[PDB]
Symmetry: D2
Subunit: 126 residues, 4 copies
């Protein structure tokens, strides 16, 4: 199945765009939430969403910053899905998942990319 997760710190942000952008990439069931991306511990909707998907499903976010503005927690979450055999996918970056160059180098590539975005997320909340 294809699960999506949205998030907004306020209604100042365009959430209809965000939700529509998810459904564009085949978002089947979407878990919406309203909270600052400062931590997951206070985000139960995400905890439920992460617990919903099982071996085979796909996780969709509009961006890593929508997942969380916390390098430690995001990368920890990305590893959780990775271990749970659930492909994380980002709509803003619809190429990161395609690459068929070299299996080893493709894993390393994706890791660095997610790590870089995860950093900018926590660096930007400042």
């Amino acid at each position: 199945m294809i699960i999506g997760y949205a998030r907004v710190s306020s209604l100042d942000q365009n959430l209809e765009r965000q939700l529509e952008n998810l459904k564009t990439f085949g978002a089947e069931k979407i878990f919406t939430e309203k909270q600052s991306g400062k931590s997951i511990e206070n985000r139960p909707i995400l905890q439920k969403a992460l617990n919903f998907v099982e071996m085979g499903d796909r996780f969709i976010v509009e961006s890593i910053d929508r997942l969380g503005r916390n390098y430690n927690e995001v990368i920890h979450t990305v590893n959780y899905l990775k271990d749970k055999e659930v492909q994380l996918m980002i709509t803003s970056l619809p190429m990161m998942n395609e690459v068929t160059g070299n299996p080893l180098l493709d894993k390393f590539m994706k890791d660095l990319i997610i790590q870089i975005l995860a950093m900018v997320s926590e660096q930007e909340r400042n």
Copy 2:
């Protein structure tokens, strides 16, 4: 507390150098083994070391290549110690703004993990 780990593919490699290298940085209980670092099933010795550490301890190795040559397993081994709050350190590359520094420390270990696998492939 300190806990070291060593490994060699054969008895042709300088095993003593690695042991002394770990002893140098204050290794107390070193876990040695003779096995190819292609998988972790062959090395329960590592599992016994990962179950040895607690919190505030420090697991050390001469290099990432000695720890393992599998990118997916190595990074998983790093994340093992990460979530247990166990300080990981490399003898060859001892790296002792936190955000940028932690990102950099991770990124380098990822590179060392990758190169370790690419050496075996060729």
Copy 3:
């Protein structure tokens, strides 16, 4: 135009393994050289290929270690193609232009990987 370049330090290496590669990817004018890859200063044929290329042209090779086995020199050679506005594309590493879907992150990702390979090229040398 597409220009190629090959290099070997010793015939111990299968030179033909390197020749047939460039010719496959539509190389019109290929150069060949036999020199130690520790320095670019003593490699004239390489420099002649760099003096022949122009704007809009494309420069191709087998790998980074064939452009030299010195980090500072290789990176200097790449930037020489940046400033001269010649697209560099390795055949060994099957990476495509536009890695993710954002020029900046693509710019960073391109440079990062080239720098990594240059390090591996010097790591094998030493």
Copy 4:
């Protein structure tokens, strides 16, 4: 000889304190300019500073963003200094082979972040 470079978009920002930071780490001759770091084409005082430095000298700034907010141009400048053999220090951020690669990467990250803000 150590040379410095300070820049601001307007006098609204703290310029003097930036100059204090430069002269601290040993900024002898300092070039100061008032313009956005969007481009180097509209920054001739930065042209003077880059043409002044030479082999053995040193170029320093408060941060990379002061040097520019354009990944393409910022990376060219650092390489230009690498060609002139002029070490580029950063006030905000003060194994040899690794150290080279490790430094260059830090610059590229900071250079990237600096553009993303603009």
